[PDB]
C-alpha cells in the first residue's frame, strides 16, 4: 500500500547449496611458534 | 582508377578511348598521327563488333566540340601475344585517316632508349576504368601519379614472385591503382610514354601486388616496324 | 479487454498495437456448451487485417471462452461482432486453429444495416464504418 518496500525492489534469495567451499589453501604465512595462520574472507550462502 | 582525380578537360591530347560497339572498352594513346597504341588483350572479347577510337574527348557522354570518333582501319596485335599470359601485350590501331590535330588532340613521344625507369619516378596514368570496387564507370577522364617500384622488390615472393620480365615494369598500388577498363592506358613518366597498362585481372589497390605495365621502350623495334 | 467513449482514433491505435494480430467482422453462427471448452462458431464476413491465419471470407472459425465470462459476453447467434485478438491466443495445430477469447480480446456488437438508421446507433455505425475503410485501404499507421 502506502508504506513498506515495493514488491519489485525486493531481491529474493536463491543460492541454497547443500555443500560448498570446495577449495584449497596453502599456509605460507610467517610461521610463529610453528603455527601458521590464514584469514579467509568467504561469502555465506542464502540458506538459513 | 582507384583513388584518382578528375583530370582537367583535354589536358591530355594523347589520351584515346578504344570503343567496342559505341561503348568504352579499353584505354589508348595516340603515339602517331594515325596510330593508337593499346593493350592486345582488348580484342579477345571483340571479334563480332565494331572497334573505334575516340580522340580529343573528356566526357564520354556530354557533347564536346573537340570530340571525334574515328574508325579502325587495321588492328595489329603483337605476334607473340597470348591470352594465357601478359607477355608482349601490345596493340597498334591504325585510324581511317590522320587525326585532326588541335588543342585537344596531339600525338605523344614514346621512349626508345631501352633502359629501366628510375625507381621512385612519378608516372601519370589515366583512363575511363572503374573508380570503385562496385564497378562504377566514370564519365570523365581520371588520372593519378604513381611511384615506380623497382623490379627487384616487385619480384619478391611476397609480391609477384619473379613473374616480372625485363620487359615489364611495376608501380605502387597502395589503395591507388589502375583498375579494370584502364587496360591499354598510357603510363607517362615525364612527358614521355614509358609503359602501357596491362595487368589482366587482380583486385585493384592491393599493395602486396603492384601494378604491371608493358615497357614500350622494350618493343621499339616492333613498333617502328608496324608504322611503315 | 474493457468495455468511456472509445472514439475512432482510439480503435485505430488499439487495433494497430504490436500484440494485436487479427481483425475480423464476424457473424456468430452457432453457440455450443461442450464439456471442457465452450464454443462460439463465427463466420468471417471480412478480413479487416489479415493475421497469421490464412482465412478467407465465408469460412468459419471456432472461438473458446470460459463460462465465468459467458455472462459478460452475452453473445447472441445471427449477430455480427467486430473482434480482434493477440497472436498468443491461438489454440491447436493448423489448419485446425481455434481462437481463444482471453482478457486481451476485443469484442464489439456490430449494429446491422437496418439498425444503423437508429438515432442511437448512427453515432456508432459511423465510427465502425470509418474504422473499416481506414484499416483496409491505408492499413495501420506507422
Amino acid at each position: 500500500d502506502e508504506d513498506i518496500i515495493a514488491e519489485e525492489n525486493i531481491v529474493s534469495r536463491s543460492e541454497f547449496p547443500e555443500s560448498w567451499l570446495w577449495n584449497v589453501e596453502d599456509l605460507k604465512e610467517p610461521p610463529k611458534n610453528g603455527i601458521s595462520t590464514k584469514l579467509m574472507n568467504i561469502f555465506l550462502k542464502d540458506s538459513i | 582508377i582507384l583513388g584518382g582525380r578528375e583530370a582537367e578537360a583535354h589536358a591530355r591530347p594523347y589520351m584515346a578511348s578504344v570503343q567496342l560497339n559505341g561503348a568504352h572498352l579499353c584505354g589508348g594513346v595516340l603515339v602517331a598521327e594515325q596510330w593508337v597504341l593499346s593493350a592486345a588483350h582488348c580484342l579477345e572479347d571483340a571479334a563480332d563488333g565494331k572497334v573505334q577510337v575516340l580522340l580529343g574527348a573528356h566526357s564520354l557522354s556530354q557533347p564536346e566540340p573537340s570530340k571525334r570518333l574515328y574508325d579502325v582501319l587495321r588492328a595489329v596485335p603483337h605476334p607473340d601475344s597470348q591470352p594465357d599470359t601478359i607477355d608482349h601485350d601490345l596493340l597498334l590501331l591504325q585510324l581511317s585517316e590522320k587525326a585532326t590535330l588541335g588543342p585537344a588532340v596531339r600525338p605523344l613521344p614514346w621512349q626508345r632508349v631501352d633502359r629501366d625507369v628510375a625507381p621512385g619516378t612519378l608516372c601519370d596514368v589515366a583512363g575511363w576504368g572503374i573508380v570503385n570496387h562496385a564497378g562504377r564507370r566514370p564519365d570523365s577522364l581520371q588520372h593519378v601519379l604513381l611511384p615506380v617500384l623497382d623490379r627487384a622488390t616487385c619480384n619478391r615472393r611476397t609480391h609477384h614472385d619473379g613473374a616480372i620480365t625485363e620487359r615489364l615494369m611495376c608501380a605502387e598500388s597502395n589503395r591507388r591503382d589502375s583498375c579494370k577498363g584502364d587496360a591499354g592506358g598510357p603510363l607517362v613518366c615525364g612527358g614521355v610514354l614509358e609503359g602501357v597498362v596491362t595487368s589482366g585481372s587482380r583486385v585493384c589497390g592491393n599493395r602486396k601486388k603492384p601494378g604491371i605495365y608493358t615497357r614500350v621502350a622494350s618493343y621499339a623495334a616492333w613498333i617502328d616496324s608496324v608504322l611503315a | 479487454i474493457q468495455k468511456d467513449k472509445v472514439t475512432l482514433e482510439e480503435r485505430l491505435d488499439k487495433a494497430c498495437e504490436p500484440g494485436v494480430d487479427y481483425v475480423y467482422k464476424t457473424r456468430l453462427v452457432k453457440v455450443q456448451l461442450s464439456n471442457d471448452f465452450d464454443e462460439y462458431i463465427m463466420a468471417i464476413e471480412q478480413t479487416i487485417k489479415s493475421g497469421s491465419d490464412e482465412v478467407q471470407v465465408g469460412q468459419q472459425r471456432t472461438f473458446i471462452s470460459p463460462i465465468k465470462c459467458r455472462e459478460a459476453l452475452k453473445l447472441e447467434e445471427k449477430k455480427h461482432y467486430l473482434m480482434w485478438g493477440l497472436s498468443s491466443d491461438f489454440w491447436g495445430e493448423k489448419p485446425n486453429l481455434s481462437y481463444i477469447i482471453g482478457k486481451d480480446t476485443w469484442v464489439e456488437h456490430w449494429p446491422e444495416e437496418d439498425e444503423c438508421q437508429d438515432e442511437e446507433n448512427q453515432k456508432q455505425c459511423q465510427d465502425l464504418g470509418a474504422f473499416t475503410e481506414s484499416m483496409v485501404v491505408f492499413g495501420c499507421p506507422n
Binding site: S14, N23, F43 | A134, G135, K208 | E17, G51, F138, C140
Partner: protein
Amino acid sequence: GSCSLEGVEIKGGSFRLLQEGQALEYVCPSGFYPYPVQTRTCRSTGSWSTLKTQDQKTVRKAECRAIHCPRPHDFENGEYWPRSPYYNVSDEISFHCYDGYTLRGSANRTCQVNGRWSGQTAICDNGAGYCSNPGIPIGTRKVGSQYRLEDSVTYHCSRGLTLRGSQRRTCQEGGSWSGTEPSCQDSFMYDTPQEVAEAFLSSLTETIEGVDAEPSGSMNIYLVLDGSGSIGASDFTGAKKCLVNLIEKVASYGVKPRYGLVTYATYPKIWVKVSEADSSNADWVTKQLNEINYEDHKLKSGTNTKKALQAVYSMMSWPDPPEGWNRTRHVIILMTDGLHNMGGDPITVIDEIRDLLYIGKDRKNPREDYLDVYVFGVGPLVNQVNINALASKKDNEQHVFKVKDMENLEDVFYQMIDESQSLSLCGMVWEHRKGTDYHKQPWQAKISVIRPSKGHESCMGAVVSEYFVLTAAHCFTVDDKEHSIKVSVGGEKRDLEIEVVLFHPNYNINGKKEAGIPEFYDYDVALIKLKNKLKYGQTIRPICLPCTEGTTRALRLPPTTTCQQQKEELLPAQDIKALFVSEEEKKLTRKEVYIKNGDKKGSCERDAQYAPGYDKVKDISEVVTPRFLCTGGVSPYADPNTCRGDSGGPLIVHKRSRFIQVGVISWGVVDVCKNQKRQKQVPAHARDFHINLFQVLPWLKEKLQDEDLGFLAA
C-alpha cells in the same frame, strides 16, 4: 496534432523533442538511463505513448535510474565474489572454480558503462562429457547438467531482461552445441558500431571464403529494408548508406554475388531480383539503393514484414529442380525495428524458406551453412525479442544487432575496406559428386625416400602453403640428399622436386643415448620447401595452422583473438575429438580419434613405458615432453592406431565445416600396422603420440613469414 507536454518530464533528467515534436527522447546524466523506455511516440489521441516496460507493465512517472550490469543469479562448479543485490558501473567481480575443475573464460570481469560485463563468460568445466560445459552467461539460468550426446540445455533470463540467441542448445555429434551462446539483454545495452561491423563481417566473410569453390555468382544476398513510418527518415537513410558501403566492402573481396533489393511497408516493393541479368552487378544494385527514398512508403506506412519475406521466398523459389540449388548459399539481411503489426508472425515464412532449401530436414545433412539470416535493429523503438526470433542462431556467430547511433556503421565499413587482406582457402572440403580421394583430403601429402638397398621410407605430410609441406622430422636424416627425396600431392602420378628440408633446431633423436633412450622424438617436425609453386586446385589445397588470422575466421572468433585463446578453443581441457588420414589399400580414409587432454592425459602418457626401448626408462616424463599430444586407447572409446606409413601425417580437428591441423603424427607405442592388415588384437596400452603445433609456433611463424598466413604476435 502535437501531444501536450504536460506530465511528460522525467525525474532527475530532461528531454528533447525530435521529428518536429512528434517524438521525445529522455536525456539522462552520465551513468543513468531513461526508464522505462528511451523514446516516446505521439499517438493520434493527443496523448503520448504509454510507458511500457520490458514485461509489458505500465508505469506512471518516468525516472532516471542508475545503470546496473545484470547480476549473476546462477553459477555452478565454483564461486563468484562479491555477491550484491546489484552492480554499479566500474564494479568488479571475479570467478573461481572448485577443485578438479578447470576454469575457461575471463576470471575477473568489470561492469562497464554499456551495462555489460567485460571479458568472456566464466565457465567451470571438468571436461567429462562428449560436449564441454556450455556455461551460464551472466544474467541467465541454465537447466541441464548432463552434457552427453543428444542431450540439451535451456536458458532463461531474469525478469525485465530479454534473451538474445538460443534458449535451447543440443549437444551435436562431433562435440559442438547447437545454436549460439545466449545473452541477457536489457533496455539500453545497444551495440557499438565497430562491434557490429566486426562481428557481422567475421561471420559473413567466412561464409564467402567457402563460396569460392568456385557472372558469377554463387551466393545470393537479399536486402530487405523496412520503410515503415515507425522508423523515421533519419534511421532509414542511414540504413541505406550502411548497405551501400557493405556492398563495396564485399566487392573489395573480388566476389560478385546476386543481389535482391526490397523495401517494405504495407506492401513489399521489389527493386532488384536475383533472377535479373544485373543482380550480380554491384554498381547496378547500388544505383537502386540510392534511388529509393523514405517517402516511397508514406501513403501506406504499414509494417507487414510477413509479405516482405514472402517477396524473398518467390525469388529463391522455382516453377517446379534447378541444377544448382543444393550448392547455393542464401543470405538474408533486413533492417527493421521488429515492430510488425500486419500479417502476423513473420517467422512462419522463415520456416517455409528452410523447407524450400531442404534445411534441417535431414539428420545426416543439416545444410545449415546454406542459409544465414541477419537482423539489424534500426527504429527508435526496437523489439529485441522479435528480431532475435528471425535471425539465425549459429555457434560462435552473431546475427542480431542493435545499432546505437547508426550511420557510424557506414563510416566503419568504409574504414574496414582493405584490398591488401587476402581471402582464406585453408581447410576447405566440399562434397563434390565424384569425390575422389584427395578431394576429401587435398592437404594430404605423400612423402617417399630412396636409400641404397636399405629400403624406402614411407611418410606423409600436409600442404600448409604454396611452397611448404609440413611433416615429421624423423622421416629424413642429415645424410639423405634432396635428390633422394620425392614428394607427391593431389594424387598426382609425378613426383615434385624439393629445394630443402627444414628441421627444427631442437630436433635431436640421439640426444638420449646416454640415459639409455634410443629414440627421442622431441620437436619431431620438419618443413619441405618445394622448388615449384603449387597451383591450388580441386585436389590440392592448404590446411589451416594454429595462431593465424586465417584460422581465427574459420573458428569465427573476433579478430582481436590472441594466440592463447585459440589454443583454449582447439585444445580445451578435455577429451578432444580429432581425426587423421590413413592409407587403406592405396585409398585414403579418415580415422576418428580422441585427444586425451583431459584427466585421461596421465593414463595415456605413462603407457609409453610399453614402447620398444623405453622399457627401462626411469622417469617416463623424460621421453614424453610437453610437446606431445596423446591419442589412442580404449577410453573413452576404441581409437584407431596410426601406421608407419601414416607417420608425419596431420592430426586434424574438424570444427564448423573447417579442418585445422593441431599436430604431427610422430610415434606410436605398439606397431599394429604390418603391410598385410591391422593387428586385429590391439593392446589397451597401444597409444599414439603427436607434436602439438602450439609448441613449435616460433619455428613455424619464422620459416613461413613470407607465406601470407598472417601468424599472430602474442
